[PDB]
Amino acid sequence: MSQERPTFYRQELNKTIWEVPERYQNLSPVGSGAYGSVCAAFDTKTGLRVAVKKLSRPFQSIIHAKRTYRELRLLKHMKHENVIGLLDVFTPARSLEEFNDVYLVTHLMGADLNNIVKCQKLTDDHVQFLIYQILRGLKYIHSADIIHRDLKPSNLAVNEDCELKILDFGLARHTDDEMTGYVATRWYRAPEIMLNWMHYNQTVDIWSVGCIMAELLTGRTLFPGTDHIDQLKLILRLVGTPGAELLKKISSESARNYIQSLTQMPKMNFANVFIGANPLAVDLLEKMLVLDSDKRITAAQALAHAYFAQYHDPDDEPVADPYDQSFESRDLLIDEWKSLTYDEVISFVPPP
Numbered sequence: 001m002s003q004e005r006p007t008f009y010r011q012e013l014n015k016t017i018w019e020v021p022e023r024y025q026n027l028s029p030v031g032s033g034a035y036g037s038v039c040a041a042f043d044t045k046t047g048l049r050v051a052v053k054k055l056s057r058p059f060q061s062i063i064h065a066k067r068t069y070r071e072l073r074l075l076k077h078m079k080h081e082n083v084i085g086l087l088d089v090f091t092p093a094r095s096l097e098e099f100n101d102v103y104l105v106t107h108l109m110g111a112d113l114n115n116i117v118k119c120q121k122l123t124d125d126h127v128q129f130l131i132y133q134i135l136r137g138l139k140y141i142h143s144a145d146i147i148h149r150d151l152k153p154s155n156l157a158v159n160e161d162c163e164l165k166i167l168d169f170g171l172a173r174h175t176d177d178e179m180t181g182y183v184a185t186r187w188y189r190a191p192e193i194m195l196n197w198m199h200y201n202q203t204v205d206i207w208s209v210g211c212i213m214a215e216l217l218t219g220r221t222l223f224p225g226t227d228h229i230d231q232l233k234l235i236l237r238l239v240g241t242p243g244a245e246l247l248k249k250i251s252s253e254s255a256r257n258y259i260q261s262l263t264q265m266p267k268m269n270f271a272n273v274f275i276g277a278n279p280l281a282v283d284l285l286e287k288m289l290v291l292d293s294d295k296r297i298t299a300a301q302a303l304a305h306a307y308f309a310q311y312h313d314p315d316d317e318p319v320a321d322p323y324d325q326s327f328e329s330r331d332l333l334i335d336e337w338k339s340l341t342y343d344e345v346i347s348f349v350p351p352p
């Protein structure tokens, strides 16, 4: 019938005012930017270390308003061990009229894959377990018909016992400048989206996993291009130049035309590339790093691969409920996106 408002308290961290319920204590900044500022906290109600993201003036434009709604809808949907999920969402605002701030609460993680790939020297069993968890989370995400679109080591978060969660799905929107040059922001992207060959699907994320897996196995970035074209050449050297069948799938005439200008190359022998690696790891890599996106292994298919024999459990690899994505094609005003967001904030039910 009803729900009770908690008591809020105010607190400044690095020149920004945080107003949060009393349950959240020991707030400590971890990061900031356009992706919102994030603090670590201790939730006294659940005994959980949590991350709290503040979105300030998330309704300054139509695109900001829609993105705020999108992020909240995304987080509300995900209920899976290997996917970041919403523990709590709140606003200190008492009505829609004063509602101009959104806080999102998730589990606090210990490090990202960039931070761990360094502190440590990973074994094959470590790689098995990390990649298994990524694919387990991806199976769930893809089953809701959500594409991550920007899978990289920086949005894969890990705790001390190597338990992994996927962050930042469905919401990456980089500028041209951020994708230019010798930059990690582009190194994990599938060729078809890097050069906009065609309308992309979920198979884009599997390419990213292959890149991440290779890096975990070798300690080296697989395709560290100095630019879009240099990266493509790195990719084509390994996987071969496109055949006739794939060329007609490239709907972009300019892109298909550039491809045809290149000297044709055969697929390399992956056993001569990833020397000393588990042959099962090499085999899976060959199935993930396929130029034709239609022919790439799926997350669900990859979980059943022999490489994951010690972790695979078909009764413990769940799919998601349907995700209603119809808002994406909808054109609304700021106050309409704001009202929708507000409804989602108040309708939130905490996890058991």
Ligand SMILES: Cc1ccc(C(=O)NC2CC2)cc1Nc1cc(=O)n(C)c2c1cnn2-c1ccc(F)cc1F
Binding pocket: 030, 031, 038, 051, 052, 053, 071, 072, 074, 075, 084, 104, 105, 106, 107, 108, 109, 110, 111, 112, 157, 158, 166, 167, 168, 169, 170, 171
């Ligand atoms: C609070 C929140 C809100 C939204 C989303 C998200 O993925 N939103 C997209 C899907 C729609 C994620 C989070 N959670 C974190 C955000 C963050 O920036 N960091 C750094 C986080 C978080 C959780 N832990 N950590 C974290 C702390 C310390 C480290 F060393 C390493 C870490 F990953």
